[PDB]
Point group: C3
Chain length 117, copies 3
């Protein structure tokens, strides 16, 4: 049971710190419990800004599930860092939306592997 | 049969909006039908600039074949976005060549999967 | 025997042109001889600067082993470019450490393939 995305994640679909699970088109991700952490087999690049409206670029390989509700049953994911030794997830930097060209950050077929207990 | 690149794509080989197919060293790519779209298993990073000579970086996962001519018999690829729902390809941002270090953007062994039709 | 990393490479562990082999948590990598070159199945993103105040990003797919000393017995890897035709390795750009968010550049499970002869 390898979990693969079935929908593309576009940069214009990111909120400041998360995105909706539904975008990835994966029932396993949609039903994953709160706090589940996944490692991606493809990098998730996140443009950020340290100030002055300037864009810089970060890379993340891990997503943490935030359980949904009636309006958004599939919930959300935050990108960040999974420490496999200490078993900790740390949220990544906020996404900065400016004038970047539209991009598929994670394409269809991205493999997601649960890494927490 | 899986199509793998046999030659590295270097950043200093990109034109503003394409690169020559021959660079990838793949006969299946060289003779792919005009307009064929491929998804990559590795990100293609394209440096761009929206102004002031400032470089930012975009990611692409899709290439569209442009048929050759007598001068370039194997033709070209453009990078861009494949919409697998609406079955459309949109060319990506222009590559901005300035003072970046030389880089292999796509190494030997990159897997290319046809996704159109 | 595919070689997979067992520890994450964090951006805050990079020196200007190398990092300690031991960080990747792999005995095969640790014992690899001076001069061994590996290709990665995942991009290694290296932030650099042109020197006017801004962080840009380069991509590398190759590492070369450099023999260590009493303080770092397993030695170091440098990122760079492997030319598979001419059998040459060229060191990549200096890493620029500024105020970037902490990032896993290469996660656990990155596959390293020896490519020098
Ligand atoms: Ca910047
Ligand atoms: Ca810049």
């Amino acid at each position: 049971a390898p979990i693969m995305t079935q929908g593309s994640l576009y940069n214009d679909s990111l909120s400041t710190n998360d995105f909706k699970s539904i975008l990835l088109g994966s029932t396993p991700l949609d039903i994953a419990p709160d706090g589940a952490v996944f490692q991606l087999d493809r990098p998730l690049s996140i443009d950020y800004s340290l100030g002055t409206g300037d864009v810089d670029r970060a890379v993340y390989w891990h997503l943490k599930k935030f359980a949904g509700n009636a309006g958004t049953p599939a919930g959300w994911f935050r990108w960040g860092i999974w420490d496999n030794f200490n078993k900790t997830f740390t949220d990544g930097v906020a996404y900065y939306s400016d004038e970047q060209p539209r991009q598929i950050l994670l394409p269809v077929g991205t493999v997601c592997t649960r890494v927490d207990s």
